[PDB]
């Protein structure tokens, strides 16, 4: 199941649905690469 969808992320332990969603550090949340 994909974790993320604008959920705030911890860059040192990024848990989002990779490789589709990654912690966008500047945005502060798990955003989609798409």
Please list, in sequence order, all residues whose beta carbon lies within 8 angstroms of the beta carbon of residue 27, skipping any fewer than 6 positions away.
none
The structural domain count of the chain equals 1
Domain interval for residue 24: 1-34
Which class for 33: exposed (0-12), middle (13-18), buried (19 or more C-beta within 10 A)? Answer: exposed
* Residue 8 · residue 20 · CB < 8 Å: no
For 28, residues 6+ apart whose C-beta sits below 8 A from its C-beta are 8, 9
- Integer Cα distance of 24 and 11 in angstroms: 8
17: tokens are: 């649905």
Cα 32 to Cα 11, 12, 20: the distances in Å are: 15, 18, 6
Report how this structure was experimentally obtained.
NMR
CB 19 within 8 A of CB 33: yes
């Amino acid at each position: 199941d994909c974790l993320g969808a604008f959920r705030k992320c911890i860059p040192d332990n990024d848990k989002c649905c990779r490789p589709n969603l990654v912690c966008s550090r500047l945005h502060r949340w798990c955003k989609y690469v798409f």
